[PDB]
Swiss-Prot record:
Subcellular location: Cytoplasm
Tissue distribution of the protein: Highly expressed in the central nervous system. Also found in skeletal muscle and at low levels in pancreas.
Protein name, per record: Sacsin
Superkingdom, taxonomy of origin: Eukaryota
Disease: Spastic ataxia Charlevoix-Saguenay type: A neurodegenerative disease characterized by early-onset cerebellar ataxia, spasticity, retinal hypermyelination, pyramidal signs, and both axonal and demyelinating neuropathy with loss of sensory nerve conduction and reduced motor conduction velocities. Other features include dysarthria, distal muscle wasting, nystagmus, defect in conjugate pursuit ocular movements, retinal striation (from prominent retinal nerves) obscuring the retinal blood vessels in places, and the frequent presence of mitral valve prolapse.
Domain notes: The ubiquitin-like domain mediates interaction with the proteasome. The J domain is functional and is shown to stimulate E.coli dnaK ATPase activity.
Underlying gene: SACS
Portion of the parent chain present: 89 to 335 of 4579
Protein's job: Co-chaperone which acts as a regulator of the Hsp70 chaperone machinery and may be involved in the processing of other ataxia-linked proteins.
Amino acid sequence: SFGQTTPPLVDFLKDILRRYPEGGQILKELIQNAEDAGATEVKFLYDETQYGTETLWSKDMAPYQGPALYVYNNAVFTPEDWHGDPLKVGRFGIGFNSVYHITDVPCIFSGDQIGMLDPHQTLFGPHESGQCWNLKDDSKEISELSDQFAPFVGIFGSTKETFINGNFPGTMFRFPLRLQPSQLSSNLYNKQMVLELFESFRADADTVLLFLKSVQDVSMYVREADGTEKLVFRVTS
């Protein structure tokens, strides 16, 4: 073969990230994604929980088991959502890619499936830009990988029953806060930086729900390592 190849996927994504410079844009894009889905509520939660690193898909999953920004809304993916141009996640707007400012491995849990994105294409093999598990079809693997899946239970109404049932009737995102610099980004978010995003959002309370018809309620929480949980800010219509 003589011919040319495009840059790697991370280079395209880095370029999209140039279009979204300022940090407050990130929560706003998530709200927009909820409104598009017909959700009526959105929650943001900063979680300091450190999860175990014994029963993971592989050893390289270990850096993603720590503190995370979670997002919830009460819409549920259909099969057409789950099957989804080429730079877009699912049927999401291109602005969903602004989450890569915060994380290298976003996770999405809705209905009967969990997916994790890996645009660096390292974690799941060389040509794989993520991985996906069906709560019903892959229930045995999920149970073997208990440390891998524990971060999706015990928040936003997800319980043991959610996994036995194989169906979460809502949408949850987990964004593990980057530990080391990567080839997407070198932002390292800690608690204070996530708190600054929450504060910036609350200060724009006049603006954030103004053009929204479906989403009527946005709440921001903190969960401490010791399991202490606290509502920081709410904005409502």
